[PDB]
Amino acid sequence: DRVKRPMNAFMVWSRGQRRKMAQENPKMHNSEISKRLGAEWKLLSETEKRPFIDEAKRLRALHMKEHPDYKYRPRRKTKTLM
Amino acid sequence: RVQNTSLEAIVQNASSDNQGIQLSAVQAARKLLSSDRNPPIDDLIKSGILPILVHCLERDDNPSLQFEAAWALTNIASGTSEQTQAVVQSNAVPLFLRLLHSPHQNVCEQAVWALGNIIGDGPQCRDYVISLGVVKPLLSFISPSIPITFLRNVTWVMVNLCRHKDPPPPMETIQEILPALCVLIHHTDVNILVDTVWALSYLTDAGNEQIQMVIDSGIVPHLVPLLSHQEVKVQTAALRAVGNIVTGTDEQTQVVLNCDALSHFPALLTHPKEKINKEAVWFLSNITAGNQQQVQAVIDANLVPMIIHLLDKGDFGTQKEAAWAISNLTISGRKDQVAYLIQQNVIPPFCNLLTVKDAQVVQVVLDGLSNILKMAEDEAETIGNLIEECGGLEKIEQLQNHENEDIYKLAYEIIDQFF
């Protein structure tokens, strides 16, 4: 279970849960913490996932705006001018 | 220009049975829509000209009337989503697709352009135009005998076919486009090359399944060399594209590394452009966040001194990415790999970022130092001295009163266990 940036909704959610789970169960290995976090993510409702979905979208939007040649990107729509 | 001519007369003349009167009216509508970058799209939509322009597309007997009407509709579709949708609801797309087989070049090109603006509106329009069969005739235009200006437009339409992620374009469509991007990635024209790579960067940003489609096309060995391309606009586009791939699985990240991607990074890390340095470190941070073999690959590439070198006396943006790259290595690296990091004088510049105002950076750096101490159990005292020598222990103690819960809680915990 890798954490690459920009993070998706699950990764940002796991980031907070990872630290808590480590403290509450110091005798649990990092592999088992990732396995349980991945499974417990499946139980969350859409309302509980929405803050982390919006954060992932926010991180994604910034990652695209911080493109070195963002100004010279191809645009979605163009006009045929005279 | 709008305030000084009857739009109603244009609309009514465009419905006239006289071809000369009709052409002049559609031409006037085109000029109204293409004389500046702020045309009166709403006024011409409200005037009822859309059904007339759409009907003109069917007049194979008047290629000039088809061209002018496609031109007018192209710029109407170039506006907001509401104005693009108005063109779609006029059922113009099936006629544009028919015009892709027109024997008149300007009619084809203008139909291509109009379809590009519609596809670029969003995933719904994109999939609508895809489902009607745009990809096959569009890619058939890609040949050695196509005018360069047309091919630039074709590649731009292909970019829009790859753009949106919710949902991404269909698998079958991605699999059709990638062989064409393989051809276009060898083109000498900078505009086509940049657009081809941007299309790849959108595909590689669409998810690990789409990243795998890109890999399975065989094009990654042709994208990686572009990291050292002479045109900087090609380099940055390629750097983001491959950067998106290494956000995938370890297997997908390894494909990039097997293409000797790291060989291009000495030049990228010393590039004059600071943003290119920041981007190149963000890439490497996603590598050091991988497995131990991939951390070793960054080591064998002689990049660790350059990452540490950029961590120190670097612009703030690049230093943040360098801190991520270092801390990620402490999470994934073996004892010897973090030992090598220590041997290269990583502690002074790493600890110098404990005073930054960004709360996330301090959190990332403290986690790294914590992992460093925990990894060298026998020599934890030696590292604690190294942290103290450079003033790091002083900065950790100042962070014991930091505002963030995770920061001051960890600062106390680090000091309890090793100080």
Author numbering:
A (entry chain B): 39 to 120
B (entry chain A): 67 to 485
Quote from the publication.
SOX2 is essential for the neural development, and the self-renewal of undifferentiated embryonic and neural stem cells. SOX2 is one of the key factors required to convert somatic cells into induced pluripotent stem cells (PSCs), and in concert with Nanog and Oct4, plays a central role in embryonic stem cell maintenance. The localization of proteins to the nucleus via the classical import pathway is an active process and requires a cargo bearing an NLS to be recognized by importin-α (IMPα). Humans harbor seven IMPα isoforms (IMPα1–7), each containing an N-terminal IMPβ-binding domain (residues 1–70) and a C-terminal NLS-binding domain constructed from ten armadillo (ARM) repeats (residues 70–500).
To better understand the mechanisms of how critical signaling regions in SOX proteins interact with nuclear import receptors to drive nuclear transport, we crystallized the HMG domain of SOX2 (comprising residues 39–127) in complex with different IMPα isoforms. The 2.3 Å resolution structure of IMPα3 bound to SOX2, enabled the entire HMG-box domain and NLS regions of SOX2 to be reliably traced from the electron density. SOX2 bound IMPα3 through an extensive and contiguous interface across ARM domains 1–9 of IMPα3. However, we found instead that, SOX2 residues Arg40, Lys42, and Arg43 were bound at the minor site (IMPα3 ARM domains 6–8) and that SOX2 Arg57 was bound at ARM 9, outside of the minor site. The C-terminal NLS (NLS2) was bound in the major site of IMPα3, with SOX2 residues Pro112–Met120 bound to ARM domains 1–4. Overall, this structure showed that, these two distally positioned NLSs within the HMG domain form a contiguous NLS interface on IMPα3 through ARM domains 1–9. The IMPα3:SOX2 interface was mediated through a buried surface area of 2034 Å2, 14 salt bridges, and 34 hydrogen bonds. Although the overall structures of the IMPα isoforms were very similar (RMSD between IMPα3 with IMPα2 and IMPα5 of 1.5 and 1.9 Å, respectively), we found that the ARM 7 domain is positioned differently in IMPα3 compared to IMPα2 and IMPα5. In contrast, the ARM 7 domain of IMPα3 is set back by 4 Å, and so provides a favorable interaction with the HMG domain. In addition, SOX2 cis-Pro44 is also positioned close to the ARM 7 interface. These two prolines lie at either end of the SOX2 HMG domain and facilitate the extended interactions with IMPα3 across ARM domains 1–9 that are not possible with IMPα2 and α5. Here we found that IMPα3 bound SOX2 with the strongest affinity, with a KD of 102 ± 15 nM (mean + SD, n = 3), whereas IMPα1, and α5 bound with significantly lower affinity with a KD of 447 ± 27 nM (P < 0.0001) and 247 ± 30 nM (P = 0.0017), respectively.
